[PDB]
């Protein structure tokens, strides 16, 4: 049993016609102190999977080390490591889920919420969640922490059910994700303006975008607000 | 000579030989014959079951390890039970933890390493059984040959047991032919039954005497005995 110390907030994602998109800001909070700003919370595994992690940062770094090892280990005595026997998004997820559930079962969790995004070898999109309790689930859109409350509602207006996937383009999807990141920056006190975004396309491959910034913010209407009820000036 | 260096597995002879291992290999040659061969779509095991009296049953020689893997034995049956069981667990672990089917190549490596430990430590003894492993994984059909010495080899076809040399020569001759028997199970089997009967001498393969197993593209590892093998005799 423990308590999280340095933490990462939301991780949001959704799937479109040809792949999946996942994003997360670059902040490492220490309680209410916005302590670290160069924190990458999207972990690429090979060229078909990206693991986004929220929660305790020390545990995130541990999970990072675990993932790099899975890659090394999978390459051992494996002449097809970069082909038919390369790590699949589903293998990576099952592994982490297994670990997450064993750790909670020993009353010593990895204090995180994880989303595994990727494209399988047969083209299928892969999007699944797992957290510190070992709980898992899939949906056309997935978000952790605050994003679950404010991002899913916006992302679900684009893909409300399975049949909406093929009708959704990378452009529409990325636009929706970027808008969601802005909304989170407006109402989540533990969020940052800078974030990373990754796209896993069954055709274009893996596109990892670093140092993005929330832009086109509306603040002007603030000049007209005065007092908290009766004040006029 | 030999007598002084064959007391245990932990002793090298003056010429660099390990006699206990060689004696274990001899138990294989005394075992009943079994054949294995594959195309690009299926893998087949054919075995001659041996009986004690005409009042006894014919001891099984083929064991299923998973839906996509299996093997045939020659030598000490109990050791085959131990080894096949270890393989059942390894296939099991792969599915439960990574949601991945175990590569036949990996299964061979695990078997090799397990056998090796019993050839370098005091007190233990080498396994006294040979194994032919077939399976269909993400890289197609496969056939492996396992020796108690720990040496595992991938072949197009092969045979072990008494008089196994007959079938082995026939297969080494039929190569170009059976390797192309794709999408036609019944043909690959007949090709195998013809190979095994090249090692007969005592009798002729009957209905409660023959044992066949197959795995492939859209064929889970299945075992055929008795009436089910009639159409091949």
Swiss-Prot record, chain A:
Q: What is the annotated localization of this protein? A: Cytoplasm; Nucleus
Principal localisation: cytoplasm
Where are the disulfide bridges?
none
Q: Which residues cross the membrane?
A: none
Q: Which GO terms describe its cellular component?
A: cytosol; nucleus; proteasome complex; proteasome core complex, beta-subunit complex; proteasome storage granule
Record key words, sorted: Cytoplasm, Nucleus, Proteasome
Q: Which Pfam families match?
A: Proteasome
Gene3D superfamilies reported for this sequence:
Glutamine Phosphoribosylpyrophosphate, subunit 1, domain 1
Q: Which domain of life is it from?
A: Eukaryota
GO BP annotations of the record are:
proteasomal ubiquitin-independent protein catabolic process; proteasome assembly; proteasome-mediated ubiquitin-dependent protein catabolic process
Q: Supply the InterPro entries for this chain.
A: Ntn_hydrolases_N, Proteasome_beta4, Proteasome_bsu_CS, Proteasome_sua/b, Proteasome_suB-type
Q: Which family does it belong to?
A: Belongs to the peptidase T1B family.
- What assembly does the database describe for this protein? The 26S proteasome consists of a 20S proteasome core and two 19S regulatory subunits. The 20S proteasome core is composed of 28 subunits that are arranged in four stacked rings, resulting in a barrel-shaped structure. The two end rings are each formed by seven alpha subunits, and the two central rings are each formed by seven beta subunits. The catalytic chamber with the active sites is on the inside of the barrel. Interacts with CIC1.
Its job: Non-catalytic component of the proteasome which degrades poly-ubiquitinated proteins in the cytoplasm and in the nucleus. It is essential for the regulated turnover of proteins and for the removal of misfolded proteins. The proteasome is a multicatalytic proteinase complex that is characterized by its ability to cleave peptides with Arg, Phe, Tyr, Leu, and Glu adjacent to the leaving group at neutral or slightly basic pH. It has an ATP-dependent proteolytic activity. PRE3 and PRE4 are necessary for the peptidyl-glutamyl-peptide-hydrolyzing activity.
Anything else of interest in the record? Present with 16900 molecules/cell in log phase SD medium.
Protein name per UniProt: Proteasome subunit beta type-7
Protein species of origin: Saccharomyces cerevisiae (strain ATCC 204508 / S288c)
Gene name, Swiss-Prot/TrEMBL = PRE4
Curated annotation (Swiss-Prot), chain B:
Crosslink Glycyl lysine isopeptide (Lys-Gly) (interchain with G-Cter in ubiquitin) sits at which residues?
A: 190
Family recorded in the similarity comment: Belongs to the peptidase T1A family.
UniProt keyword annotations, A-Z: Cytoplasm, Isopeptide bond, Nucleus, Phosphoprotein, Proteasome, Ubl conjugation
Tell me, how does this one assemble?
The 26S proteasome consists of a 20S proteasome core and two 19S regulatory subunits. The 20S proteasome core is composed of 28 subunits that are arranged in four stacked rings, resulting in a barrel-shaped structure. The two end rings are each formed by seven alpha subunits, and the two central rings are each formed by seven beta subunits. The catalytic chamber with the active sites is on the inside of the barrel.
Location in or out of the cell: Cytoplasm; Nucleus
What is the species listed in this Swiss-Prot or TrEMBL entry? Saccharomyces cerevisiae (strain ATCC 204508 / S288c) (Baker's yeast)
Keyword Protease tagged: no
Per the record, its GO cellular-component terms are: nucleus; proteasome complex; proteasome core complex, alpha-subunit complex; proteasome storage granule
User: Which PANTHER family does the UniProt entry name for this protein?
Assistant: PROTEASOME SUBUNIT ALPHA/BETA (PTHR11599)
Which pairs of Cys residues are joined through disulfide bonds in the record? none
Modified-residue entries (Phosphoserine), positions: 13
Phylogenetic lineage:
Eukaryota, Fungi, Dikarya, Ascomycota, Saccharomycotina
* One GO biological process term: proteasome-mediated ubiquitin-dependent protein catabolic process
**Functional description taken from the UniProt entry:** The proteasome degrades poly-ubiquitinated proteins in the cytoplasm and in the nucleus. It is essential for the regulated turnover of proteins and for the removal of misfolded proteins. The proteasome is a multicatalytic proteinase complex that is characterized by its ability to cleave peptides with Arg, Phe, Tyr, Leu, and Glu adjacent to the leaving group at neutral or slightly basic pH. It has an ATP-dependent proteolytic activity.
What gene, per UniProt, encodes this protein?
Answer: PRE5
Q: Does the keyword Iron apply?
A: no
Q: What else is known?
A: Present with 7210 molecules/cell in log phase SD medium.
Q: This protein is called what?
A: Proteasome subunit alpha type-6
């Amino acid at each position: 049993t423990q308590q999280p110390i340095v933490t990462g907030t939301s991780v949001i994602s959704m799937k479109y016609d040809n792949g999946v998109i996942i994003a997360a800001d670059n902040l490492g909070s220490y309680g209410s102190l916005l302590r670290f700003n160069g924190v990458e919370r999207l972990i690429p595994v090979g060229d078909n999977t990206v693991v986004g992690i929220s929660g305790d940062i020390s545990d995130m770094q541990h999970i990072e080390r675990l993932l790099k090892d899975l890659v090394t280990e999978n390459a051992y005595d494996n002449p097809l490591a970069d082909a038919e026997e390369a790590l699949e998004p589903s293998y990576i997820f099952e592994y982490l889920a297994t670990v997450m559930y064993q750790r909670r079962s020993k009353m010593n969790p990895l204090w995180n919420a994880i989303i595994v995004a990727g494209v399988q070898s047969n083209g299928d999109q892969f999007l699944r969640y797992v957290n510190l309790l070992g709980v898992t689930y899939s949906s056309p859109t997935l978000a952790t922490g605050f994003g679950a409350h404010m991002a899913n509602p916006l992302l679900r207006k684009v893909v409300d059910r399975e049949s909406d996937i093929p009708k959704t383009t990378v452009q529409v999807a990325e636009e929706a994700i970027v808008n969601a990141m802005r909304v989170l920056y407006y109402r989540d006190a533990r969020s940052s303006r800078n974030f990373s975004l990754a796209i896993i396309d069954k055709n274009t491959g893996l596109t990892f975008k670093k140092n993005l910034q929330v832009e086109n913010m509306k603040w002007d209407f603030a000049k007209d607000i005065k007092g908290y009820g009766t004040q006029k000036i | 000579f030999r007598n002084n260096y064959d007391g245990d597995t932990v002793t090298f002879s003056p010429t660099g030989r390990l006699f206990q291992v060689e004696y274990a290999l001899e138990a294989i040659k005394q075992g009943s014959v079994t054949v294995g061969l594959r195309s690009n779509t299926h893998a087949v095991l054919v075995a001659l079951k041996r009986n004690a009296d005409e009042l006894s049953s014919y001891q099984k020689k083929i064991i299923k390890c998973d839906e996509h893997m299996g093997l045939s034995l020659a030598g000490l049956a109990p050791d085959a039970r131990v080894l096949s069981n270890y393989l059942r667990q390894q296939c099991n672990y792969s599915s439960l933890v990574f949601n991945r089917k175990l590569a036949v190549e990996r299964a061979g490596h695990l078997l090799c390493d397990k056998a090796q430990k019993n050839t370098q430590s005091y007190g233990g003894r080498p396994y006294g059984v040979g194994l032919l492993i077939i399976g269909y994984d993400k890289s197609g059909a496969h056939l492996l040959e396992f020796q108690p010495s720990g040496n595992v080899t991938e072949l197009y076809g092969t045979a072990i047991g008494a008089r196994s040399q007959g079938a082995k020569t026939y297969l080494e001759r039929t190569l170009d032919t059976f390797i192309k028997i794709d999408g036609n199970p019944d043909e690959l089997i007949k090709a195998g039954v013809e190979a095994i009967s090249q090692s007969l001498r005592d009798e002729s393969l009957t209905v409660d005497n023959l044992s066949i197993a197959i795995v492939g593209k859209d064929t889970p590892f299945t075992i055929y005995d008795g009436e089910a093998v009639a159409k091949y005799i």
